[PDB]
Design a protein around this ligand. Structure first.
Ligand SMILES: [Cl-]
Ligand code: NI
Length: 345
């Protein structure tokens, strides 16, 4: 029913795990699992959803997702065995997994999925959030390694889709999730002086500062900011504020026909060509604002490039699933952060 999803399963999923073969360790990430769970839900694919969930729990979460956040990285170890390569969590993926479970629970009337999504979400609060001066409670990028000093944290704009955060608060209200929505909105709006979001940025007590490691680069992480924002319902007051800053991006598309591999968020100047994944990632945004780009023809170009990412290009494939899937009306987000797949109505 969703051709691109059927292709993705064939070429990227092996017995419940999403494989990124660009790493010679033939890795699976909690990110890959999280996106595949979401896509399986959008596709009304209960069987694959179950397979993905089971693999995630067994291999990344010690057989119990109610007991711990999943490890983010799994694959071939130096001795040839397969196992966890990094036991740290990745909060963006934790959030996508919790969201997909909550939404699958609602859409499929599956009380287990509802409960599991809830218990995972509660653990995200426990294990990878912290309250800092001025910004309040933030979602940290992982359970360890992102607290850099007193009231000083390293954050990642792409990790916090406002629609997912809205959803955390709408059936079981939570002062913590409300605070995280607010700090995330502030993070997004205040670190894009030219309408471009960095991959990483620090909050140091009283202000945002250039990330000491990643500097001012916006690249593969950050391209998702435009993706999530372009798919917000206009009920979210932050959508208009974020999109109001993105005229430079639209001009980049007019002139260069796509976003660059890396962009300097302070100057708006970019390096290299970004690729079909990044082009799909900006498609919802492109469809939502005025520019000289013919959107229909832009989408046709993306479609023409799909055979080239049939295999061996995990990340471009998930970006195209998100962006083309949305453009082709396969799913939309609602005012309460929930998602309505095409198959519902
Ligand atoms: Cl619905
Ligand atoms: Ni019920």
């Amino acid at each position: 029913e969703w051709g691109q999803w059927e292709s993705f399963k064939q070429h990227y999923i092996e017995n419940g795990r999403v494989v990124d073969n660009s790493d010679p360790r033939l890795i699976t990430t909690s990110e890959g699992q999280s996106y595949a769970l979401f896509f399986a839900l959008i596709a009304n694919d209960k069987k694959t959803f179950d397979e993905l969930l089971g693999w995630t729990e067994l291999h990344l979460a010690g057989g119990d997702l109610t007991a711990q956040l999943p490890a983010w990285l799994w694959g071939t170890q130096p001795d040839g065995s397969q196992g966890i390569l990094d036991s740290n969590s990745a909060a963006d993926s934790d959030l996508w997994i919790a969201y997909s479970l909550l939404e699958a629970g609602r859409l499929w009337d599956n009380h287990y999925y509802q409960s599991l999504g809830h218990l995972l979400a509660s653990r995200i609060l426990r294990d990878e959030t912290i309250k800092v001066s001025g910004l309040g409670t933030v979602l940290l990028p992982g359970k360890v390694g992102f607290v850099l000093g007193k009231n000083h944290v390293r954050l990642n704009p792409s990790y916090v889709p406002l629609q997912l955060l809205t959803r955390m608060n709408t059936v079981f209200p939570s002062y913590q999730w409300e605070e995280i929505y607010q700090s995330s909105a502030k993070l997004l709006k205040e670190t894009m002086p030219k309408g471009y979001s960095p991959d990483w940025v620090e909050w140091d007590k009283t202000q945002f500062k250039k990330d000491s490691k990643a500097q001012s680069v916006g690249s593969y992480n950050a391209i998702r900011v435009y993706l999530w924002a372009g798919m917000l319902p206009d009920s979210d007051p932050n959508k208009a504020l974020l999109l109001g800053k993105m005229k430079p991006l639209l001009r980049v598309i007019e002139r260069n026909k796509g976003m660059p591999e890396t962009i300097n968020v302070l100057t708006g100047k970019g390096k290299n060509q970004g690729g079909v994944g990044m082009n799909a990632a900006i498609l919802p945004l492109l469809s939502s604002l005025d520019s000289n780009t013919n959107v229909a023809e832009y989408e046709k170009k993306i479609q023409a490039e799909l055979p080239k990412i049939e295999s061996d290009y995990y990340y471009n494939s998930v970006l195209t699933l998100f962006g083309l899937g949305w453009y082709q009306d396969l799913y939309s987000f609602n005012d309460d952060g929930s998602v309505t797949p095409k198959w519902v109505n």
